[PDB]
Amino acid sequence: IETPITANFREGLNVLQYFISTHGARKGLADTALKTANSGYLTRRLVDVA
């Protein structure tokens, strides 16, 4: 985006700055919750070789 967050937490947010942050929050969160399987597979396939 080419028109940023200007203010901060003390000064006070805008509704849409907040709402833009919700996107990045949600994307990173879905990445977190959905890669324990990825390591799951890599680890366990590697161990079954052991």
Partner 1 sequence: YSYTEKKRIRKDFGKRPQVLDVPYLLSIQLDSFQKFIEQDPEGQYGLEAAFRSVFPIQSYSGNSELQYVSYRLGEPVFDVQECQIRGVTYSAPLRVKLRLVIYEREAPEGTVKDIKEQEVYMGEIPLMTDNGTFVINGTERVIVSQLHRSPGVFFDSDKGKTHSSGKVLYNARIIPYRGSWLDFEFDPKDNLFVRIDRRRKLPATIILRALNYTTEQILDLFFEKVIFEIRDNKLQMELVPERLRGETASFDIEANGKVYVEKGRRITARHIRQLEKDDVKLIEVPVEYIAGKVVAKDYIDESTGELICAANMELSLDLLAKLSQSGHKRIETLFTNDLDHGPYISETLRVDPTNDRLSALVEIYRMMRPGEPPTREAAESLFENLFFSEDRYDLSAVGRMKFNRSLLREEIEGSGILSKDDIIDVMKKLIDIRNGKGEVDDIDHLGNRRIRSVGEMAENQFRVGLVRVERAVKERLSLGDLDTLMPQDMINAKPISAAVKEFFGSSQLSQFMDQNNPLSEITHKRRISALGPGGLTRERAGFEVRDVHPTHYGRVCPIETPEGPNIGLINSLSVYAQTNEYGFLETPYRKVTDGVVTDEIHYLSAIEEGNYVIAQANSNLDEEGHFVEDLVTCRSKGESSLFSRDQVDYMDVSTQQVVSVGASLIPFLEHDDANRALMGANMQRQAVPTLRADKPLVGTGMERAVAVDSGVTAVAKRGGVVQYVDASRIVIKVNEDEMYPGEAGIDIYNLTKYTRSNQNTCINQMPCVSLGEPVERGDVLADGPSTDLGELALGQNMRVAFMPWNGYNFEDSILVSERVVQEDRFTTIHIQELACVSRDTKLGPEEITADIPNVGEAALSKLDESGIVYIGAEVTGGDILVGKVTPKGETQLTPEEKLLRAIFGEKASDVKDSSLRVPNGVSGTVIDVQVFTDKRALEIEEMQLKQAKKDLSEELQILEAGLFSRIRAVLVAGGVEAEKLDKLPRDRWLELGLTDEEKQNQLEQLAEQYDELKHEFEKKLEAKRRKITQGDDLAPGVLKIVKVYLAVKRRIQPGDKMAGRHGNKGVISKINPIEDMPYDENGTPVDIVLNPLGVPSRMNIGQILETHLGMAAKGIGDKINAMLKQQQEVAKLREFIQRAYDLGADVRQKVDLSTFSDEEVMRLAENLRKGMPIATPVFDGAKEAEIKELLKLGDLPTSGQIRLYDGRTGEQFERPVTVGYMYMLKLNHLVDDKMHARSTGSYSLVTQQPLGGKAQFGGQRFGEMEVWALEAYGAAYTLQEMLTVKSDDVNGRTKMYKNIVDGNHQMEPGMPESFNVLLKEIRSLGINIELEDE
Partner 2 sequence: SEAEAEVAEIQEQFQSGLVTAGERYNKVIDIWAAANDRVSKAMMDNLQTE
Write out the residues near partner 2 by the rule CB under 8 A.
1-4, 6-8
Cα–Cα nearest to 46, from 4, 38, 32: 38
Cα–Cα nearest to 20, from 36, 34, 6, 35: 6
Nearer to partner 2 among residue 4 and residue 24 (C-beta):
4
> What are the two backbone dihedrals, phi and then psi, of residue 5, each rounded to the nearest 5 degrees?
-60, 120
Nearer to partner 2 among residue 12 and residue 34 (C-beta):
12
Q: Binding string to partner 1 for residues 3 to 32, with x set by CB under 8 A, is what?
A: x-----xx-xxxxx-xx-xxx-xxx-xx--
Cβ neighbourhood burial of 27 (10 Å; 0-12, 13-18, 19+): exposed
Interface residues toward partner 1, by CB under 8 A: 3, 9-10, 12-16, 18-19, 21-23, 25-27, 29-30, 40, 43-44, 47-48, 50
